[PDB]
Amino acid sequence: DANLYVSGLPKTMSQKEMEQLFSQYGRIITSRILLDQATGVSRGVGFIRFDKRIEAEEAIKGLNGQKPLGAAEPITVKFANNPSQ
Known part of the structure; x- marks a missing residue:
């Protein structure tokens, strides 16, 4: 899955x-x-499922930003380990 x-x-x-x-x-x-x-929780994250894993890999690099000790303010598009993979 990508x-x-x-x-x-x-x-x-x-x-x-x-x-x-x-x-x-x-x-x-x-x-x-x-x-x-309101009916769940304020996540703030955003998933993206590309058709091919190469489309999510090449993109994860042209979008991922950074994440300091307080990883949460900046962006970080990294593959989702997924708790059901």
């Missing part, structure tokens, strides 16, 4: 806003930003 896990996103991170950012890297399959504050 899923993605970009955490440390701003509140302006929209689901489709994340789909156009990774869509330009390669036709994405299913994308969405995990961040809720």
